[PDB]
Design a protein around this ligand. Structure first.
Ligand SMILES: [Zn+2]
Ligand SMILES: [Zn+2]
Ligand SMILES: [Zn+2]
Ligand SMILES: [Zn+2]
Ligand SMILES: [Zn+2]
Lengths: 154, 303, 379, 379
DNA sequence: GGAGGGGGGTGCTCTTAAAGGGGCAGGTCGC
DNA sequence: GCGACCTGCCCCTTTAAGAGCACCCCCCTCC
């Protein structure tokens, strides 16, 4: 039932994203731009704000302590499947990423970001967040920084 | 070795025949706990008996054991009789540890209530009667050492009672891995050697601004190089070598419940759940009655 | 032996159309459609009222050591015990040699659940189908017996008797016995919160068996041909046959090393039924929860496609010569899988930690959305 | 109960059309048609070219006690010997209670051939039928289990564990085990010329059961109507259903007291086949000849009326839970029958002297025209 | 009958920050 | 003068959590 692939771009300014199908364009527009909403996490002290309704359900996982994912080898409990997937790399002993200058291999991009400091590369990076001038390379990284740090809360 | 399995076997035989006499009179036919249907009888020979039957008999043997003259045995000698019985079982192929195994938990409780009331006897002349059970009796009977997890736990408890002078379960629980500090001795006898010992600060006081604290006060463990098997340091090292890595460095407890099943090459022997107060009390009454512990208690208590 | 090459009927003067599996009415629910009723019957034949014996004024192990399998039955002489087990499975693989090996492994698996790594004697029940022609009987039965004896040899025991009877379907099985000291077997009644379950063999063998027999029926194949290619079915069938023809001697030996509390086998009733039976035995108040379900590659897709036939995600698919569900503490389990993968003796195999143990009411469940692990066909 | 009203489907709410024997296809030709092939299969099961191990410079008992049945496997502890047996008999009588009793008795009778008078454990294979209604399963199987367990009580043991399977035919059986000392079992190897064989049960059970199954269908009863009536079959059928449900504990105990050399059970293969198998493991070079056969009442004429389907006189006719073919000296044997006929405890039963042991070629044969002594039910 | 739209909920890949264990490097006391 | 011990700080790795897209599932639909 997979429809043929076509590419359509959100003509709205500030969103140059191109989507895999015309189907997804309606969902993108509605859930991102047109649907302007604000919610508050029910937790007494969270004080966070999420415009989508999907995000809150994920956020509820953070405040609770329900761990439904168990590693095959060490029987350790995780809150999300992808966290487990990253954990399994320890047991299989695989290091996918690799620095392109000194050939230094790591397991996660967080390690690589640390290594890039040795091979000083922020000089050629152009993007940066307005608050604390983080000096990122790409754009969505600034959004991730604004999410984890400089959080939007009440 | 002053340990006679023959005496224990003879006492068991006497009790077994005496009970068999009463078993038929009651006319209450109750089947034995074995596969084939037979009238419950206590085999005169210890070896050819089931675990349930042996446990039940040793339970009743505590209250119905009778001396050669027909008088009930003393609490100080029932323990010796049971040690002789266990030595008989060990030396005849049986692997049952009547004191430690879970199946024999009922037996220890009755033996415990028999032994708890014991007190050293003072003769009319005045001198205290020495106990009939000695340390070598336990060592030869394999109730001490590093043969099984329970035996190693009991050995550590016995050494702590002997040296650190712990004489009560409530006082004895204070011991913990953290507060039991290991310090290689500063002064070896000769540069070639390197003496090692274990210490514990059992002094109770305000301990304010260096008061009540001195090097010569806190209790200490020696080291026995003559026979490494009985050396307290070796057994303590073996104990820490088998307990789980997570337990070391916690202040809550020192004695861990032994794992149910262990093999010769099992890296870990003990769980992380400390032995309950009931078990510690059960296995502490059995180690106060011993003679050397009594002497150690008297010497420190006397001064 | 048929290990060198796949069993070819022509090589043994058998027609191409011949298939050993034709002598059994295979079904997705296994050799027992009303699993619940058979549980009641097995409880009925096991249960005995006289064994309580007023508790003998104490607490001692029962004759039915756990009330479900591998009765201990203490003897008179030397205080020893007689652990004895029985099991019977109809043919599920075309190869007669491998089928006999599978039957022997299934018979022995019950003992290895209790930690017993040695078998003094074993018996065999060989049943010859009525429909099988005389020319087939003298060509397949010798292979089955040779495979059974070879499996017994690898287990350190010998088949030294049995019985042979006529049957509409081939019935293959045996009985394993061992006389052991009280310290040579783990009685699976201990279990404490914080332990982690361990499995030694992947699930979904019945699905692989059923699919391989659907490659000749055009009506059934077209339903499932969409989701799985023939090569995947072939490799899955080979892996299941190799797994089902494997002994748990190493797992039983390691059980003692790593302080195992309880264990069982997954032969029949699926993973959930056996866990439920095991949970009731535990002295403490502990309930099992299973989060991971290792399955043979691509079998889960078929399992969900076929509908309410297997339900691996529900832990009800029956298995033959299954693995061991061992309850170990966390660090011991972490070490257990490492050693079984690369034993000192060699010839290791992977194992998985499929769940946890928590305080409950002596029950076992499976999380709503188990994390299906697709085990690759290694070598 | 033994004398209680026979299983009546109306009493237990089952429809009148119900018939326990309907779940299996009784074959009056034989218990297992390819017996000469199946005996070869069983010999292959029991054969071990490695057990000899250079014979170990001794005439000790082989790994198999006789190599035919009741294997005596030495154990590691205390020089004890493990003795096991197994049997699987499909239903042949219409009362579920007695069927479990007969299955237990048939399983046990192998041990009593070797003189073992005590049983330690007993399993049970209870196979329900696919072609069985849901209510029938719940109203039939419990009776069989209860009968088996009750028969275990009389045996002096207990039924602990077992297995249950689905099988187009109902299968009832079990495995009886005993760890016995060297001075508790009689090894069938020994024998001496001048002896007389003794049978503790009459022959012709198969004929009686088959003929009573023939009463319902009217197209078969006609050709045997002349020889016997329905009343005669009722008494013969009741007697057979009573003898084949009788344990041989008294026979086993008296085997020691009377210096029995060797003995065997007449189950399945027929008296001739079992005697021949017994003659194949005698240290001496002796042979058995049977000059007398105690056939059940009117069951000798019937076999003639059925041509060569039964063949009771030739000794090929199968039997289930048959007696013991004990070989005793002439002087001792005369007393053995006297003791068994009028036991002190009670429950008298008859035994006969059938044949003589004479020097030969280690094989058994029957005279041209054996005399038939008619045994009528006691009162 | 029907392929197309609307509404909803979800797994997966990517990204970042926070927590944490290990190890290098000080200051203090003892020999 | 040399060392042991406690503690502080940095390095690098692992866990935790948000963003958004591609996807499925269900339902409805008027042509
Ligand atoms: Zn947009
Ligand atoms: Zn929140
Ligand atoms: Zn892990
Ligand atoms: Zn680099
Ligand atoms: Zn910033």
């Amino acid at each position: 039932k997979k429809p043929p692939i076509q590419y359509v771009r959100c003509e709205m300014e500030g969103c140059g994203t191109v989507l895999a199908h015309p189907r997804y364009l309606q969902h993108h527009i509605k859930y991102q731009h047109l649907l302007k909403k604000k919610y508050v996490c029910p937790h007494p002290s969270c004080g966070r704000l999420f415009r989508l309704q999907k995000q809150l359900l994920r956020h509820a996982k953070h405040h609770t302590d329900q761990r439904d994912y168990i590693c095959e080898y060490c029987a350790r409990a995780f809150k999300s499947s992808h966290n487990l997937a990253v954990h399994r790399m320890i047991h299989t002993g695989e290091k996918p990423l690799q620095c392109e200058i000194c050939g230094f291999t790591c397991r996660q991009k967080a390690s690589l970001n640390w290594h890039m400091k040795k091979h000083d590369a922020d000089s050629f990076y152009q993007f940066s967040c307005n608050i604390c001038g983080k000096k990122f390379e790409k754009k969505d990284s600034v959004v991730a920084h604004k999410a984890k740090s400089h959080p939007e809360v009440l | 070795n002053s340990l006679k399995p023959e005496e224990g076997l003879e006492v068991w035989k006497n009790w077994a025949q005496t009970k068999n006499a009463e078993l038929e009179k009651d006319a209450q036919n109750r089947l034995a706990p074995i596969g084939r249907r037979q009238l419950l009888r206590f085999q005169e020979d210890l070896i050819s008996s089931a675990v349930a039957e042996l446990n039940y008999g040793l339970c009743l043997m505590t209250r119905e054991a009778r001396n050669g003259e027909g008088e009930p045995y003393d609490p100080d000698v029932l323990y010796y009789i049971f040690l002789c019985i266990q030595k008989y079982l060990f030396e005849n192929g049986r692997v049952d540890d009547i004191f430690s195994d879970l199946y024999y938990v009922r037996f220890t409780e009755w033996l415990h209530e028999v032994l708890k009331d014991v007190q050293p006897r003072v003769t009319p002349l005045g001198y205290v009667l020495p106990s009939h059970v000695t340390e070598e009796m336990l060592w030869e009977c394999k109730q001490l050492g590093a043969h099984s997890p329970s035996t190693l736990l009991t050995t550590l408890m016995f050494f702590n009672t002997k040296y650190f002078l712990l004489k009560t379960v409530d006082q004895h629980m204070k011991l913990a891995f953290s507060k039991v500090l290991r310090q290689t001795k500063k002064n070896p006898s000769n540069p070639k050697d390197k003496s090692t010992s274990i210490r514990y600060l059992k002094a109770l006081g305000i301990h304010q601004t260096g008061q009540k604290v001195t090097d010569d006060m806190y209790a200490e463990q020696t080291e026995n190089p003559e026979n490494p098997l009985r050396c307290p340091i070796k057994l303590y090292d073996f104990y820490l070598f088998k307990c789980p890595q997570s337990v070391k460095g916690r202040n809550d407890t020192f004695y861990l419940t032994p794992e149910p099943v262990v093999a010769p090459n099992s890296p870990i022997w003990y769980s992380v759940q400390p032995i309950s107060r009931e078990q510690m009390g059960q296995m502490l009454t059995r180690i106060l009655v011993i003679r050397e512990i009594q002497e150690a208690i008297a010497v420190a208590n006397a001064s | 032996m048929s290990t060198r090459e796949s069993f070819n009927p022509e090589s043994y003067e058998l027609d191409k159309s011949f298939r050993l599996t034709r002598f059994t009415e295979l079904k997705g629910t296994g050799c027992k459609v009303p699993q619940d009723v058979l549980q009641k019957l097995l409880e009925s034949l096991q249960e005995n009222h006289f064994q309580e014996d007023e508790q003998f004024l104490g607490a001692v192990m029962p004759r039915l050591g756990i009330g479900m399998d591998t009765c201990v039955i203490p003897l008179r002489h030397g205080g020893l015990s007689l652990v004895q087990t029985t099991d019977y499975i109809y043919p599920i693989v075309d190869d007669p040699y491998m089928m006999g090996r599978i039957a022997c492994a299934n018979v022995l698996s019950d003992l290895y659940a209790m930690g017993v790594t040695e078998c003094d004697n074993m018996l065999m029940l060989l049943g010859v189908s009525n429909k099988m022609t005389d020319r087939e009987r003298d060509k397949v039965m010798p292979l089955i017996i040779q495979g059974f004896k070879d499996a017994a040899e690898e287990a350190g025991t010998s088949v030294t008797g049995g019985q042979t009877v006529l049957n509409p379907w081939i019935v293959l099985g045996g009985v394993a016995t061992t006389v052991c000291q009280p310290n040579e077997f783990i009685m699976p009644d201990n279990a404490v919160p914080g332990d982690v379950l361990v499995l030694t063999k992947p699930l979904g063998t019945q699905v692989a068996v059923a699919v391989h027999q659907w490659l000749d029926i055009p009506e059934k194949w077209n339903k499932i041909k969409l989701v799985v290619t023939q090569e995947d079915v072939e490799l899955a069938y080979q892996e299941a046959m190799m797994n089902m023809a494997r002994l748990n001697r190493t797992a039983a030996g390691l059980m003692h090393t790593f302080n195992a509390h309880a264990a069982t086998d997954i032969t029949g009733f699926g993973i959930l039924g056996h866990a439920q039976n095991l949970a009731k035995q535990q002295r403490n108040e502990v309930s099992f929860v299973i989060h991971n379900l290792p399955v043979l590659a691509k079998m889960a897709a078929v399992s969900k496609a076929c509908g309410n036939m297997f339900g691996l995600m529900h832990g009800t698919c029956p298995e033959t010569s299954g693995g061991l569900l061992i309850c170990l503490p966390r660090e011991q389990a972490a070490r257990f899988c490492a050693e079984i993968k690369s034993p000192k003796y060699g010839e290791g195999h992977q194992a998985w930690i499929i769940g946890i143990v928590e305080k409950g009411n002596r029950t076992a469940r499976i999380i709503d959305k188990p994390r299906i692990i697709e085990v690759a066909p290694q070598v």
